Design a binder for this molecule. Sequence first.
Ligand SMILES: CC(C)CN(CC(O)(O)[C@H](Cc1ccccc1)NC(=O)O[C@H]1CO[C@H]2OCC[C@H]21)S(=O)(=O)c1ccc(N)cc1
Lengths: 99, 99
Amino acid sequence: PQITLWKRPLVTIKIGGQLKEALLDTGADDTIIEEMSLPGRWKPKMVGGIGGFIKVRQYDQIIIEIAGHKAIGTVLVGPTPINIIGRNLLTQIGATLNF
Amino acid sequence: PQITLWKRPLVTIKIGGQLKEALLDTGADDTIIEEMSLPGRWKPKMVGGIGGFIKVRQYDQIIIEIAGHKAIGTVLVGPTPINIIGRNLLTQIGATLNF
Ligand SMILES: CC(C)CN(CC(O)(O)[C@H](Cc1ccccc1)NC(=O)O[C@H]1CO[C@H]2OCC[C@H]21)S(=O)(=O)c1ccc(N)cc1
């Protein structure tokens, strides 16, 4: 699909058995998901943006379905105000920015 | 152009007669630029990002050239870690997300 940007580019994602809404975000290096339980081992990490830094749990090799498309990668879990799909997973689904 | 996302999508912008680098950011509603002097009156705005809220100055009807494309619109100025081009100006240059 070709997504115009008059509105936030929100899509449905499936992660750890749950269905969620998330933002397709070319400005995000990594994917960040709101507080949830995911299986496996994790490591703590700090992620910085506007307003400062937040502490997140880094999970590796997680499978996510993005708009019907299977992708695997690192997922950061923490107190984010919005679920964000960042470049680590956008590349896997072949997303491009075009103008 | 068609831009892939293996690397940050950085472009050159020209604002206030200066050349600067900025991130094309579909996850940003607004365009936010680091501290610099712009003409005219400004208005106050609060911007909420991943780590908290920041106060910025809002300037309207600012001419900015984005990777060679001329856009005219609202720019926010404040302590952002990186210049960000958000959807308000991405739509002016006709950018879309495709996959
Ligand atoms: C600051 C830039 C370099 C990075 N951000 C991504 C984002 O797309 O720039 C962010 C994604 C985001 C969206 C909404 C809430 C929180 C984060 N939006 C954002 O800060 O936008 C600001 C300006 O415009 C307003 O609209 C959105 C919120 C304001 S970030 O969320 O801090 C971020 C940083 C690191 C990683 N791995 C993932 C995300």
